[PDB]
Amino acid sequence: MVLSEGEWQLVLHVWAKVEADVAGHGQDIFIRLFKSHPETLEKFDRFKHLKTEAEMKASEDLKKHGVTVLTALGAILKKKGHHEAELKPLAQSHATKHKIPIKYLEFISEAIIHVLHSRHPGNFGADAQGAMNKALELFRKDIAAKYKELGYQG
Ligand code: HEM
């Protein structure tokens, strides 16, 4: 699949807002993910002990992790589709070291959309959300293709 320049512009416009506070967006996204799909928390040995949202918000390590994840996702989005190089190491670590099913990538994509919708309604209308969903589906499609090449079905 391919996004038009117009769709990329909608994606990058709202992402520019996210970049005004990466750490804050990272926390909301992971808390949303862990609360909506608790099973995903079991994949993080470093955070699986967190019991409440209060504990999650207070975790310095979780906040730092969120910045690392969003920064990588941002680098990929800014390539506007030409992200083959950025995807390689990401796909290998998540398929071989962390063992993350495509299903879980769908869950975090939902968390991202939810948080952007909550925080940036003025820059995340129907068209912009459609553009973001398309960019995330492209991301998941390409990561899935790499998973297969690497020998991981998940
Ligand atoms: C938006 C998609 C995602 C991106 C861009 C992303 C990015 C990253 C990055 C950059 C790291 C650190 C470097 C590395 O280990 O490769 C990381 C670590 C990790 N990711 Fe992801 N990730 C994504 C989705 C997920 C999902 C959905 C899970 C599973 C619920 C997951 C589980 C992990 C784990 C377990 C680690 C190691 C954390 C640690 O022990 O420090 N990731 N991810």
Structure token digits, residue 146: 């790499």
Residue 130 has a CB neighbour count (10 Å cut-off) of 12
Among 106, 107, 90, 110, which Cα is nearest to 98's?
A: 90
CATH number, domain containing residue 36: 1.10.490.10
For residue 101, the Cα-to-chain-centroid distance in whole angstroms is 14
Beta carbons of 38 and 93 less than 8 angstroms apart: no
Dist. CA 94 → ligand 1 center (Å): 7
Beta carbons of 67 and 22 less than 8 angstroms apart: yes
Q: What angle do CA 106, 14, 68 make, to 5 degrees?
A: 60
Among 15, 34, 23, which Cα is nearest to 120's?
A: 15
Q: Which residues contact 51 (CB under 8 A, 6 or more apart)?
A: none
How many domains are contained in the chain?
A: 1
Residues with a CB atom less than 6 Å from ligand 1: 40, 43-44, 46, 65, 68-69, 72-73, 90, 93-94, 98, 100, 104-105, 108
Q: What angle do CA 60, 11, 72 make, to 5 degrees?
A: 40
Structural domain boundaries, residue 147: 1-154
Structure token digits, residue 14: 């709202």
What is the number of the ligand 1 atom nearest to the C-alpha of 47? 40
Dist. CA 69 → ligand 1 center (Å): 6
